[model samples]
Target: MRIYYIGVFRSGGEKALELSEVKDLSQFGFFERSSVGQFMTFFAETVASRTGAGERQSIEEGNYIGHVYARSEGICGVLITDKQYPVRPAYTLLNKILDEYLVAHPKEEWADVTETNDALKMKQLDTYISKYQDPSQADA
Candidate 1:
């Protein structure tokens, strides 16, 4: 769904091959004075509070538009459909998006890859993630 992801975009390895077709929500949404960039966590709070009850009138009323967040030196974000979605497919979408994103925004470093480990750890678990594809190759 459309929610802000708070993390950093570290130079993980090589440039990603996929890019997200998703639009940057911050570039086109109304927000409060404290709702910008790094303060994206606030946006997450807003969305989470809307899960139950009609707390979020806009979302509850079906007026929800999208989401926004700040760029991280070690983290990245992706916009997904606003509904129950499978992780496998969603993960695939994120990888594809990152691949395309790296192509459009060329990077000289390989450390820009974002990892899902931290987010997973927040849930009281640890895990390992392997990077795929050779970003060293020049795009055709």
Candidate 2:
């Protein structure tokens, strides 16, 4: 099946998840921040914010960065980062793995070419599922 990722950032602070070119992204409780550092706290004060929690899953450090990965029903990845920090290296590594993983598992092609189809949808191993325009009480 086609793999998708939703990066989650900032554990205690707010969070942000990336959206696919398609409308498959789910809305989470978080504001979009541009970079890191801005979303930091000091002396119990919520200072100026850059990219919120979800935005900076990857922290920047020279050519290296930090990020978090999780396998949900689908693929999800997050880059923990900030303005002074760049999550480039981390993103590159994870992106490589992600591409390999997606190529490993391809989605089944359906007879109906509709955009509403799910990425994880697959056909039976030994049989095929029938599709009809109208609802019918029958099995293929």
Candidate 3:
């Protein structure tokens, strides 16, 4: 599975407070990478409307694809991956990330954080990606 992007956003917002976007284009084609990044918020809205907090949804738009998990408290976690990526592992990663995210940062903390101050949150995103990308090796 090619993980294109991972992000955390407020339910009603346009910008993600914390995001781990793929820096390497070697693994992705133009349509795949661009579409996934461009339509992230659109997919987030689509899934959030259909899913309750603590629920998960798989997102697909043409050649773009990924998974999303939202908390009832208006927070959502997203994992953008290749079409071949499995749903089970994607959601598992989302769940695990959310578990740690909620514990480390409160809802109010998002308001206080910006791109400059988001290093810690970004580090958390990196940790989760390294730990969960393998699916079988990641904790379920």
Candidate 4:
């Protein structure tokens, strides 16, 4: 089981804005990382946007599963992993994702997010994705 991507989004609009993300493509070809990155980003944002507030959803695209959790406050989080990754840890991390995200970013700041490259304030995504990739860390 391997994680491909992790992201946070601001929804409740027509579409979700990807605020920040972390990705892993070391298992794939170096040249293919960009392509894989695009795929993960596209699905991550799409699934997150469709999810309603207080909803939890899992979308399957081939061998990958995108687990998303949307807070009633309009913030959402996504975890993209191969089908082999367990569902329990995925959602656990999603809850923690939004929880910790707000610690560093208040919900009021989410409105200004208009694009991908900016408003990328949650630097902990990199560390979270890496440590939680082990799954046991998330379970704990």
Candidate 5:
């Protein structure tokens, strides 16, 4: 199981604002890396926007499964992983992301984001994306 991407979004009426994201596309060809990463980010935000807050679901996308969780407060977290990955660990990591993200940056601060770049900077995203390649580790 591998973590291709992880992103936090501000869920609202329509489009989701990407608060922050991290990706590990080294497995893809050099040329496909950016495209793959972009698609995952696109998929994450799109699905999360459509998802109701407090709702959770898994959507199949190509060779990956995007596990999404949207908090009632409007924060959404998505984890992209290979189909081989288990759903249990996927949500575990997703929850971890949403939980810690709130600590790093307050919930009220989310509305201040006007654009993707306006999102609060987070270093743990880069660390978590790589460190939790094996979702089980996140469970641990």
Candidate 6:
């Protein structure tokens, strides 16, 4: 399972505060990073704004599949992966990322952030990336 990207975006505005993209997609050939970023941003905003929209689970987009989670406080977490990726862990990773983001940066800080900050450096991101390499670890 190839996990291509993970991102956090503001809910209403859909601004990408922090994002990480895999350097090379396994199995799938190279794809433009910026294009993926744009798509995620749009999807994040759409899901964030929808009324009564529960956390978006999985949606097929072109050759890639996306999983999204919208927080009540106006933030969205997104994970983009290849078709072969499992759905449960994709959402688990998003849930973990959003939880950590809220804890690392206060609610007020989310709106003030215009670019990636030291908070993004939280080692938890790295740990989770490696931990979730196996979908089973998502529950652990």
Q: Which window of ten consecutive residues has the lowest lDDT sum in model 1?
A: 124-133
Model 2 residue 62 lDDT? 47
lDDT of 3: 0.55
What TM-score does candidate 4 get on C-alpha atoms? 0.84
Where model 2 places Cα greater than 4 Å from the true spot, the runs are 1-56, 59-66, 69-74, 78-86, 107-140
Looking at candidate 3, the ten consecutive residues that score lowest on lDDT are 17-26
Clashing residue pairs in candidate 6, if any?
none
Q: List model 3 lDDT by residue over 1-140, tens digit each.
A: 55555655444444434433322133448766576445654554455445544666677757546577776555666666567667777666766666656667676665324442333465665565555555334462
State the lDDT of candidate 4 residue by residue for 98-127, as single tens digits: 777766657766533565442355667666
List TM-scores for all candidates, in order: 0.29, 0.24, 0.61, 0.84, 0.84, 0.62
The stretch of ten residues in a row with the least summed lDDT in candidate 5 is 111-120
| Worst lDDT 10-window in candidate 2 | 125-134
Whole-model lDDT for model 4 versus the true structure?
0.72
Worst 10 residues of 6 by lDDT: 19-28
Q: How does each model score on lDDT?
A: 0.29, 0.26, 0.55, 0.72, 0.71, 0.54
- Give the Cα-based TM-score of candidate 1 against the true structure: 0.29
Question: Top model by lDDT, which number?
Answer: 4
Give candidate 2's whole-model lDDT: 0.26
Q: Candidate 6: where are CA atoms >4 Å away?
A: 14-24, 27-54, 111-123, 138-140
For candidate 2, the per-residue lDDT at 108 reads 31
Cα lDDT of model 6 by residue, 22-136, tens digit:
2223443456555655565465335434422235655577766666666666555555566777877766776677677676879767643445542344455546654555544
Ranking by lDDT: 4, 5, 3, 6, 1, 2
Question: lDDT per residue, candidate 1, 21-92, as tens digits?
Answer: 212233435663235432433333343333222121112214222222212222243332233322444344
